[PDB]
Amino acid sequence: GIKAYAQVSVESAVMSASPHQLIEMLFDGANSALVRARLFLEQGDVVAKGEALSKAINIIDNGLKAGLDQEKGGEIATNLSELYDYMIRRLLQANLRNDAQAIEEVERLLSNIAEAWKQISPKSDYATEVSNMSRAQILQQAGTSVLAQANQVPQNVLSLLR
Amino acid sequence: EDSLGMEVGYRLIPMVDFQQDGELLGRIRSIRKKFAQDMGFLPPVVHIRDNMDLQPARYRILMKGVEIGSGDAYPGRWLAINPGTAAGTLPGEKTVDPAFGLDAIWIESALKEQAQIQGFTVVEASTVVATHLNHLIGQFSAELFGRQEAQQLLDRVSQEMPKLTEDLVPGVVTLTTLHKVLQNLLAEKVPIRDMRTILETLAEHAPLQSDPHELTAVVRVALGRAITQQWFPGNEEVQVIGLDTALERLLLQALQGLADRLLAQTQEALSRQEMLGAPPVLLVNHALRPLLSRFLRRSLPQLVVLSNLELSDNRHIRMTATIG
């Protein structure tokens, strides 16, 4: 019953997802985990906070960063890889120091990239400029950014979100 | 009319329009694809029409023109479903999930993660209808397997098993008998993926057996290990319900009134299977198995009736409930 809605919510969306839509689910899945880890930390549940951050780190590392293609991507892939390494390093500090603003800036940097990715459908201060450069590359270079990021397998997206 | 149809209000058109967002349209095609993967045949399409007589956010699932399910689905809102152990209070539209009977509430997208903090299963609007459709096509998996679904499936196995299909149809087994047997498997939640064994078993017993129900029992015991795994994966503890050794000597004799008494005790046994987490499986003698399966599952469709000959011998078996 309860697991039926949770299973269909992910499986029915992954099986019909294009290579571009598989990346959208990783951004949306990582965003909800960061908000969960933020709300858990605001209440005091450090255990649940650590569980939510581990899911967010797993989506960014083994999903978004794992789907990066160096050769076909070029500058877009490496710029996202450095930007993804900053998020993982900041979320590890957010779980070890119980820092809430560290989750918020990663939540903000991910949204700065995901908003540009949702509009490209196929047919501290230094990290912000790194995301702005990636945001401009995604909007101005569509196909090369799809070759850079949209390379994940539906089998991997399911296990990361399930 | 339409074997599988769906009528939606005008508010649900963007979810079923390929030119717009169309989230619900893509989910139906995923459920149909997993249907074709799990059960073993391609089900008929879900023809989607718009009905302005319905409420804006109202949908209706049709089958042969007969309504089998309906409910509400608000696009911009999320459905936070309560498993029964979630705390806190959410603002929104209190309701009940259409596919089942759990308490749920339609909330704004901003409270999506907040609802998950309090222990709610939050799904989008297109998922609410997709889950309701997936829950319904599984119950009617046998009715979705017509003669054309059996003919195309026979042409598929003809390309992969020409040596078996050549002499089997239509000489040994007719398409009517072949469709009757395969539908009997689907009627009791056993897939027909292993077409190697099904056609092979028919090539062994059909020259000496013409009754499709007798062929179904023989094909089912050949798929015995597959049926054992779909209810007992790995080498777990087989936890089934059993009949009293006395009661077997009552039903066997009737085979060779107080049926309401049987119905009452069978329902109790299913309730105590929910404790310890055991499947609603009814293990019984091979002679009683086909009779009380077509009898108990009329009012208890969730009950699964098994036989001693199809349950794997080399496994940890143990009775849990008792009807007697």
Residue numbers in the entry:
A (entry chain B): 6 to 128, 160 to 198
B (entry chain A): 360 to 615, 623 to 690
Give verbatim lines from the article.
FliD and FliC are found in complex with their dedicated chaperones FliT and FliS, respectively, in the cytoplasm. Here we report the structures of the ternary complexes among the FliD and FliC flagellar proteins, their cognate chaperones FliT and FliS, and the export gate protein FlhAC.
Similarly to FlhAC−FliT−FliD, NMR analysis showed that the highest quality spectra were yielded by a ternary complex formed between FlhAC and a fused construct wherein FliCC was covalently linked to FliS. The structure of the FlhAC−FliS−FliCC ternary complex was determined by X-ray crystallography at a resolution of 2.6 Å. The binding interface buries a total surface of 680 Å2. Amino acid substitutions that perturbed the binding interface decreased the ternary complex stability, with FliS residue Tyr10 and several FlhA residues in the binding cleft being essential for complex formation. Specifically, FliS Tyr10 and FliT Tyr106 interact very similarly with the FlhAC cleft and the Tyr residue is absolutely conserved in both FliT and FliS.
